[PDB]
DNA sequence: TGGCGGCGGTTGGGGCTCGGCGCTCGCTCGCTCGCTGGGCG
């Protein structure tokens, strides 16, 4: 995003029978329609790095909230 | 000259019905916004 300085938050929390989070970044930078461009890439970077290759089983590891349903 | 007993209709009420309007789920597709690749040569 080239904004070091922008505010977030984050929660470690556990859902019903898998640990999840409840991360929330700014928009300062990050439109809605780059914001599906710049979490494919992390969601990338993420693999082959912390995992070292291992992808994992979980459905929906890592995405965004949507408004509605589907 | 005399009265005491049952049978077809109801006729609104509980119920099925077809419609309206109202909402709530899948699909979509011109647009956008990057990522990168022969070629410059």
Redesign the pocket.
């Known amino acids: 995003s080239k904004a070091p300085e922008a505010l977030f938050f984050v929660q470690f929390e556990k859902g019903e029978s898998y640990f999840h989070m409840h991360v929330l970044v700014e928009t300062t930078g990050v439109?809605s329609?780059?914001l599906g461009?710049?979490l494919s890439?992390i969601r990338e970077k993420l693999i082959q790095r912390i995992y070292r290759g291992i992808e994992p089983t979980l459905p929906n590891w890592f995405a965004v909230t949507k408004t509605?349903?589907?």
């Open positions: 439109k329609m780059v461009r710049f890439q509605r349903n589907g």
